[PDB]
Amino acid sequence: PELPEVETVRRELEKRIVGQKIISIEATYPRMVLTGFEQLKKELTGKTIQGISRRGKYLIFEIGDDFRLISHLRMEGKYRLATLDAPREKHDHLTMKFADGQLIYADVRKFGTWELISTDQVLPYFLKKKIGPEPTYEDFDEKLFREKLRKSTKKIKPYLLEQTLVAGLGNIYVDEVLWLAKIHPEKETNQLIESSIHLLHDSIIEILQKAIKLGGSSALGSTGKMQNELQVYGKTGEKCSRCGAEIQKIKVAGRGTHFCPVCQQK
DNA sequence: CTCTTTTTTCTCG
DNA sequence: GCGAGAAACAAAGA
DNA sequence: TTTCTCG
Numbered sequence: 001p002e003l004p005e006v007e008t009v010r011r012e013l014e015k016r017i018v019g020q021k022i023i024s025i026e027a028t029y030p031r032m033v034l035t036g037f038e039q040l041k042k043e044l045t046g047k048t049i050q051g052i053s054r055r056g057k058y059l060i061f062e063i064g065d066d067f068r069l070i071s072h073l074r075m076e077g078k079y080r081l082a083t084l085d086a087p088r089e090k091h092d093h094l095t096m097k098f099a100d101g102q103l104i105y106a107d108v109r110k111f112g113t114w115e116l117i118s119t120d121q122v123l124p125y126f127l128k129k130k131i132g133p134e135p136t137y138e139d140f141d142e143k144l145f146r147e148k149l150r151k152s153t154k155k156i157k158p159y160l161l162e163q164t165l166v167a168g169l170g171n172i173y174v175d176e177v178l179w180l181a182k183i184h185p186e187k188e189t190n191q192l193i194e195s196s197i198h199l200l201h202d203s204i205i206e207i208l209q210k211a212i213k214l215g216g217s218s219a220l221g222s223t224g225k226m227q228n229e230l231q232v233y234g235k236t237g238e239k240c241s242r243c244g245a246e247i248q249k250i251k252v253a254g255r256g257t258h259f260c261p262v263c264q265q266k
Numbered sequence: 267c268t269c270t271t272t273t274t275t276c277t278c279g
Numbered sequence: 280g281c282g283a284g285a286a287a288c289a290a291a292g293a
Numbered sequence: 294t295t296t297c298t299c300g
């Protein structure tokens with residue numbers, strides 16, 4: 001999941017589990033609780049969920065007054081809300097049980113993580129990861145963005161994916177963003193001129209805010225509609241510009257990369 | 267049998 | 280620094 | 294790394 005899907009999950013969770021008391025926590029895969037399942041079980045049991053926030057692709061459960069559970073879904077993490085008597089499915093790893101239902105975390109590839117953090121350690125946690133600004137007009141300052149692009153020789157697609165220029169882009173939306181900004185994924189960022197950087201800046205914000213509006217692309221968050229709006233991701237061999245160009249797929253810095261060669265020249 | 271495909275972090279030259 | 284490659288893991292799809 | 298797929 002990328003920022004839009006996580007934000008969709010956040011919103012659904014906010015509606016359903018805020019105000020609920022955690023009755024018990026169970027794990028068939030405790031190793032995904034990086035700070036220690038035992039400790040997490042002991043601190044959070046009996047606590048009431050006060051809210052859910054998000055930073056980039058990270059979910060943040062606000063539980064009791066002094067704890068935060070930071071959850072990352074990585075590649076295939078999924079939450080679902082189920083009755084207390086729901087059967088176990090094969091890749092369920094964790095469950096937070098309430099009085100009248102449970103929240104189950106599943107992850108086929110086991111990449112997803114949980115970390116229990118002190119409330120005043122949350123801001124330092126994201127500082128250490130060097131996570132960039134949220135993709136909004138208010139937080140995503142184009143001037144700093146521009147200064148960083150100009151000082152670097154990195155290719156624009158893997159640089160954007162670093163989460164440091166701006167938070168929340170993953171493989172789908174960076175491909176959609178570069179298509180929309182008419183920029184080649186392998187463009188060296190110090191070659192970008194001012195007007196391209198401006199278009200790229202706005203496009204990053206516009207695409208992500210749109211995806212959020214449509215509930216993300218495709219359990220919680222499984223009713224998204226952004227996938228219908230995708231212009232290049234996963235559409236190899238299909239048309240992009242009303243002239244005849246087909247979408248090409250190449251490998252860039254280890255990632256499958258979809259682009260329209262005629263519209264996205266260097 | 268083999269290989270490649272689908273977020274974050276680490277190695278290493 | 281930097282980037283190429285791989286690690287963590289499961290299930291495809293060839 | 295493990296298992297499936299027409300296997």
Ligand SMILES: O=c1[nH]c(=S)[nH]c2[nH]c(=S)[nH]c12
Nearest residue numbers: 161162163169170171273274
């Ligand atoms: O956190 C990341 N760091 C790097 S270097 N690349 C990358 N690609 C995605 S997606 N996330 C990240």
